[PDB]
Design a protein around this ligand. Structure first.
Ligand SMILES: *[C@@H]1O[C@H](CO)[C@@H](O)[C@H](O)[C@H]1NC(C)=O
Ligand SMILES: *[C@@H]1O[C@H](CO)[C@@H](O)[C@H](O)[C@H]1NC(C)=O
Ligand SMILES: *[C@@H]1O[C@H](CO)[C@@H](O)[C@H](O)[C@H]1NC(C)=O
Ligand SMILES: *[C@@H]1O[C@H](CO)[C@@H](O)[C@H](O)[C@H]1NC(C)=O
Ligand SMILES: *[C@@H]1O[C@H](CO)[C@@H](O)[C@H](O)[C@H]1NC(C)=O
Ligand SMILES: *[C@@H]1O[C@H](CO)[C@@H](O)[C@H](O)[C@H]1NC(C)=O
Lengths: 214, 107, 53, 170, 231, 173, 54
């Protein structure tokens, strides 16, 4: 088998920049490689075939280079549609192999998250389970730390987060952390809060709520 | 009957292409492809290479700063295209080892 | 000059680089086929042709 | 209206493949292509076609090859170097296609013979080589029996007694 | 126009097997090959195998040593894949891709040599629980006029299986500021997701906001409303 | 546990030689290498290996190939001449190995078939080609009989009547 | 046994070398030898040529 190795794995470059992606082969491929583009929520699309041949309808900013075992894809003058995940593929021999791929994100200006808190409703307590959610809206960069605090009691092994893909205009992210416990467990404590830490904030901002009151 | 016939064969075409081998100048085959490009569109493709049309100016005239070649100041290229219609319109000059300078700047 | 794509460029204009050799011009630029004196070289892509059916 | 094999000719009316079978039996005549031998031949041609066009000789700044004026000794050398280069590459090109073509003609002829021998091996003592690229099968071989030969599942022992009887008894 | 129509999404249990089909259109099914590749949620592409539309010959990946089987129907021109002994890890979206040329000489300098035409994909889900509809809960705007300038409200689509669930606000009227989050897998094995939207605080009392949730597997069509709670 | 021949199969457990025999008879299974066919193939490979390395290109004073400074027209020519030379020799090397390898693969496959035909010639009408690179010998062939086939002294007339009876029978000969 | 089987074959290796031919980029073979020298000792041999260190 021929192992393919994509180097950048994750990448950030602003619009109008130039960005390079590398693919090194375990064996001699001799020109017969292909690059694919996959936008979020859609199927992969063939970008260039052979080392450098562009597919019909592909602009010209995309430039493929390489031979033998060293291959590269470079994108100049970046545009919003060019932000997607990219995969190289060897077609020299069976088994054909794709790669881990490179994710392309947009680094704009630093934006602090809007932190909001929402208590569990009265319909939810009937089921016998209650969930607390801490919402972070429109921020950059992605690495953001979220910690829950129940009457000053450490939380672990009880929460799950979810992140959106990059949206179209503000080019920022949104996150939702969700802690879930039973009615019985929910009945024990009064104060509930989520502490957020991000590069935009000088200090961790805290939105909280007390149970029994709105 | 008590027997049967089973023949083995290969396909053929009404008129095949002639090719060459080590022993033969002309052997008809079912198909062949040309390996020598002999035709051109007659035009130069502006992509993928950055093409710079000199028009009335040469690389040296542009280098020195001939009045009608002022548009080429701080200009860059992958391939500089020199036209036969090009002319000089400044002070009359000569360049000993012109070829080397032309090659040098072009590179 | 025209708006289109071609790796190989010659004084006669751009040429496709699909073939390994070329007869257009010894002067070239880019990923070009090797210049040769022959105007045609046919490579067999099938078996020898025999007439009866 | 006897059928003939590959020795004297090729089969013009054949679009399903490159190599194949033609039969004449109790249920009438028929024809069929051999797909694996066909693709095998094509796979080899693809392989050499790929190799001849592997590598892209990407060259940028080079020496001058045309001259408007008479200079002298250096010009003569530049002309000689290029003229030498072109002759050598033109030789390499002429030779390459000749070697490739000869090999292509041989490997395609080889596939025909491999298919004939594969079939000969199957039939064992139940048939005889008529010499024109055909087999005289010495037993009642209906369409299903013919397909079994083509798809490689023909059991000779089933028809051996019948065939040996037809072959030697007069 | 050339097209690759795949079969509908499937829900299966650990063990068992699946047979995904892929109908071909606009090109001769013969003279071409078909590759199958899959993508697990959040993961990259994985090549499973290839089959010739001409000879029927197959090429498989080491991972699918004897678990995958690729078959073909020349007329009608459709391709199948069979994956046996399913596991939770096998949960992924399976693509059918036109990949090689057959019955004619074609070099590797052509787009057809590579994975030229892709299908929309087919999601197959391997889990133990049965199909279940979602439970929508109201998410009201809290505190004193939220921040002050901008407000946020939403809908919590909890406990449903399998994916996907569609959600819209005011039946497509409200689009700006909307953020539907990707689903998360619970410890129970069920999916859950949230959808929120940012609006001006002044509009809370006057304007009305409705979330329209749709879940085709269970045929659950829910339309819930949220406004500030009466303390 | 049937035995199989060379058609689409190789024998991993084989150290005495390159080509050989494997049998199934009254005294059980066995294996043996064919030494002459092995050495014949090797002798051919030695021959071509010798030829590719038979010339020693002894070169002394040559032109300069590296330059510290930008000079001009003559430098460009010196670079071009060498770049040209290297491309031509790199082509010759690539082609040579390709032609040699193809031929080596063919002559080794040829050596196998020659051994098969040699054996086929010996057995005459006492055996049939099963098609998988094996022979069905139609008579009691003990170890000594097998050995005689391998060392090329098998007398077909000795076993002809026995074999012809076993081959051509519909019920009774 | 009244009959016997006689098979002819060739040897094989658990893991062989890849080489190139006119038709194939990668065909596994039982053995191969390198024809391109790519390594050096890093030192210059004082014999057989008379070397003069500047
Ligand atoms: C093509 O057919 C045969 C090929 O053997 C040739 O003799 C004939 O002259 C050709 N005819 C035309 C019209 O090219
Ligand atoms: C290319 O142009 C040259 C002049 O630069 C001319 O002599 C030659 O005939 C042309 N060849 C082709 C194929 O156009
Ligand atoms: C071969 O053809 C026969 C019918 O003649 C059929 O019974 C058998 O299953 C076929 N075998 C294969 C492998 O297709
Ligand atoms: C020759 O080959 C090309 C490329 O495979 C194919 O398009 C064409 O139909 C072939 N012609 C014949 C007569 O086989
Ligand atoms: C061949 O082998 C037989 C025993 O099977 C032996 O009698 C005979 O002498 C051998 N011949 C040679 C030339 O070794
Ligand atoms: C032999 O080589 C192949 C690749 O050439 C490799 O994948 C395989 O694991 C090797 N086998 C052994 C037993 O080392």
């Amino acid at each position: 088998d021929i192992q393919m190795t994509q180097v950048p794995v994750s990448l950030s470059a602003f619009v109008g920049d130039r960005v390079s992606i590398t693919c090194r082969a375990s064996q001699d491929i001799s020109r017969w490689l292909a690059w694919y583009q996959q936008k979020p929520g859609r199927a992969p699309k063939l970008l260039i075939y052979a080392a450098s041949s562009l597919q019909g309808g592909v602009p010209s900013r995309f430039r493929g280079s390489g031979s033998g075992t060293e291959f590269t894809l470079t994108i100049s003058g970046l545009q919003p549609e060019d932000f997607a995940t990219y995969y190289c593929q060897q077609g020299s021999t069976f088994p054909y192999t794709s790669v881990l791929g490179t994710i392309l994100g947009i680094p704009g200006t630093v934006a602090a998250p809007s932190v909001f808190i929402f208590p569990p409703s009265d319909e939810q307590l009937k089921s016998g389970t209650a969930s607390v959610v801490c919402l972070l809206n429109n921020f950059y960069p992605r690495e953001a730390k979220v910690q829950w605090k129940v009457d000053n009691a450490l939380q672990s092994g009880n929460s799950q987060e979810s992140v959106t893909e990059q949206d179209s205009k503000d080019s920022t992210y949104s996150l939702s952390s969700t802690l879930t416990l039973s009615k019985a467990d929910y009945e024990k404590h009064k104060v509930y809060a989520c502490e957020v830490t991000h590069q935009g904030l000088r200090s961790p901002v805290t939105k909280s709520f007390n149970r029994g009151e709105c | 009957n008590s027997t049967a016939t089973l023949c083995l064969g290969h396909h053929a075409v009404p008129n095949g292409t002639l090719v060459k081998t080590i022993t033969d100048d002309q052997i008809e085959v079912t198909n062949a492809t040309e390996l020598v490009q002999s035709s051109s569109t007659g035009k130069i493709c502006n992509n993928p290479h950055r093409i710079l049309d000199g028009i009335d100016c040469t690389l040296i005239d542009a280098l020195l700063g001939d009045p009608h070649c002022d548009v080429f100041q701080n200009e860059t290229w992958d391939l500089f295209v020199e036209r036969s219609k090009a002319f000089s319109n400044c002070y009359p000059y000569d360049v000993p080892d012109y070829a080397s300078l032309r090659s040098l700047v072009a590179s | 000059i025209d708006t289109c794509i071609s790796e190989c460029i010659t004084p006669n204009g751009s040429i496709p680089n699909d073939k390994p050799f070329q007869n257009v011009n010894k002067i070239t630029y880019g990923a070009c086929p090797k210049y040769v004196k022959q105007n045609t070289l046919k490579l067999a892509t099938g078996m020898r042709n025999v007439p009866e059916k | 209206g006897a059928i003939a094999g590959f020795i004297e000719n090729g089969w013009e009316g054949m679009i399903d493949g490159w190599y194949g079978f033609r039969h004449q039996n109790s249920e009438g005549t028929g024809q069929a292509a051999d797909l694996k031998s066909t693709q095998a031949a094509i796979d080899q041609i693809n392989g050499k076609l790929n190799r001849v066009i592997e590598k892209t000789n990407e060259k940028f700044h080079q020496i001058e090859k045309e001259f408007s004026e008479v200079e002298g000794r250096i010009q003569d050398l530049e002309k000689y170097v290029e003229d030498t280069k072109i002759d050598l590459w033109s030789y390499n090109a002429e030779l390459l296609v000749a070697l490739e073509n000869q090999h292509t003609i041989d490997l395609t002829d080889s596939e025909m013979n491999k298919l004939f021998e594969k079939t000969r091996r199957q039939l064992r003592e139940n048939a005889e080589d008529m010499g024109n690229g055909c087999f005289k099968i010495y037993h009642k071989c209906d369409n299903a029996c013919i397909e079994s030969i083509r798809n490689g599942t023909y059991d000779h022992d089933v028809y051996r007694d019948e065939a040996l009887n037809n072959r030697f008894q007069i | 126009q050339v097209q690759l129509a795949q079969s509908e999404n499937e829900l299966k249990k650990p063990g068992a097997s699946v047979k995904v089909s892929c109908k071909t259109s606009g090109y001769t099914f013969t003279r071409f090959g078909m590759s199958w590749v899959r993508q697990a949620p959040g993961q990259g592409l994985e090549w499973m195998g290839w089959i010739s539309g001409y000879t029927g010959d197959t090429k498989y990946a080491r991972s699918f040593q004897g678990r995958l089987t690729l078959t073909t129907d020349t007329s009608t021109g459709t391709a199948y894949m069979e994956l046996r002994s399913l596991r939770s890890d096998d949960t992924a979206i399976y693509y059918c891709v036109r990949n090689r040329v057959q019955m004619e000489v074609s070099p590797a300098t052509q787009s057809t040599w590579y994975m030229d035409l892709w299908g929309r994909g087919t999601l197959v889900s391997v889990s133990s629980p049965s199909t279940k509809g979602p439970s929508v809960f109201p998410l009201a705007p809290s505190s004193k006029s939220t921040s002050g300038g901008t407000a946020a409200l939403g809908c919590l689509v909890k406990d449903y299986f399998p994916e996907p669930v569609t959600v819209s606000w005011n039946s497509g009227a409200l689009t700006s500021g909307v953020h539907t989050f990707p689903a998360v897998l619970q410890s129970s094995g069920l999916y859950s997701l949230s959808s929120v939207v940012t609006v001006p605080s002044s509009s809370l009392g006057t304007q009305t906001y409705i979330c329209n949730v749709n879940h085709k597997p269970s045929n659950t069509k829910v339309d819930k409303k949220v406004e500030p709670k009466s303390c």
